[PDB]
Amino acid sequence: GQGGTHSQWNKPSKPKTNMKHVAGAAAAGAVVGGLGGYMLGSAMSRPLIHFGNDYEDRYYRENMYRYPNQVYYRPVDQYNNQNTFVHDCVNITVKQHTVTTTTKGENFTETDIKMMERVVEQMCITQYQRESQAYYQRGA
């Protein structure tokens, strides 16, 4: 024959454009050097403390707008009993209260400080149960 034709060419062209990177950070008021492993709990509906005395009852009612609505504690997996969870929770919460108060100046009378101890322990019992239920339902 006087000629002929043929064609062939490469199909691939240039490298794959797939790539990945990530960056980002955040901060929180946890991981205190003398703590290392505790977290913020959740708030709840207004826990109105009653003391039997109307005088004390009124004191709490007018000042509750200045009281903590949240508590802090170590996780459930570090406890074999409810009382230990409550003891950590009450201590860390009042600790947070005193360090900000002594640095910023006084904001409540001694009487108010005696009231807030009650609200913190009551919130600890309530939160402990919520955290425990969360641990059981997640299959921890």
Side-chain angles (χ1 to χ4, degrees):
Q2 73 192 67
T5 186
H6 187 71
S7 180
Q8 35 179 107
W9 62 96
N10 197 37
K11 290 86 183 177
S13 293
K14 107 198 177 299
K16 202 78 179 182
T17 50
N18 94 87
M19 63 184 77
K20 186 182 175 66
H21 71 271
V22 67
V31 205
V32 198
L35 258 299
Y38 82 119
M39 284 150 282
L40 228 180
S42 298
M44 63 190 77
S45 183
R46 55 206 167 190
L48 177 53
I49 304 294
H50 298 297
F51 313 91
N53 293 303
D54 290 306
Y55 164 82
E56 292 188 279
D57 189 83
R58 182 178 177 179
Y59 254 64
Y60 180 89
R61 280 153 62 181
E62 294 185 354
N63 289 301
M64 60 134 69
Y65 290 81
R66 303 179 178 95
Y67 280 35
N69 304 128
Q70 238 151 312
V71 296
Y72 321 83
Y73 37 66
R74 291 208 73 207
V76 185
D77 54 83
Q78 301 290 294
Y79 298 107
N80 192 51
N81 208 321
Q82 64 100 253
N83 68 291
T84 33
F85 192 107
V86 173
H87 285 179
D88 176 50
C89 169
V90 67
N91 179 85
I92 299 299
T93 308
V94 301
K95 187 180 189 174
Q96 197 76 283
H97 144 243
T98 190
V99 298
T100 189
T101 306
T102 196
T103 309
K104 85 192 293 185
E106 300 183 349
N107 298 268
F108 341 96
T109 168
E110 187 191 277
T111 316
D112 268 308
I113 295 163
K114 297 174 76 174
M115 307 314 197
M116 64 182 71
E117 298 303 303
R118 280 93 150 207
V119 80
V120 174
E121 66 178 353
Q122 292 292 306
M123 286 189 288
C124 293
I125 274 84
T126 306
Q127 282 306 119
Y128 161 69
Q129 294 179 71
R130 293 171 74 179
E131 298 296 331
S132 301
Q133 288 167 38
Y135 264 64
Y136 293 119
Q137 77 182 17
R138 69 188 285 190

